[PDB]
Symmetry: none
Subunit: 31 residues, 3 copies
């Protein structure tokens, strides 16, 4: 599957951005 690779990469790219912001929010919530 050639087109499926972009599907998982985009989901991974946005999910990692969601996890990136949550880590920023969790740091600034305690601190």
């Amino acid at each position: 599957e050639p087109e499926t690779a972009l599907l998982v990469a985009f989901v991974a790219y946005y999910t990692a951005l969601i996890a990136l912001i949550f880590a920023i929010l969790a740091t600034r919530r305690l601190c």
Copy 2:
């Protein structure tokens, strides 16, 4: 291809772990 889809799945599961790790820190 399978070689690129495998790397995209690592990124996906690594993003899932980072997302779970973020939840564990929020609950505390």
Copy 3:
């Protein structure tokens, strides 16, 4: 639970960046 969750937030931060890299690395294969 106290200052411990701060370090766990740092683990989530760098793990997400690693996921961002593999998402870009998987795009380079196309």
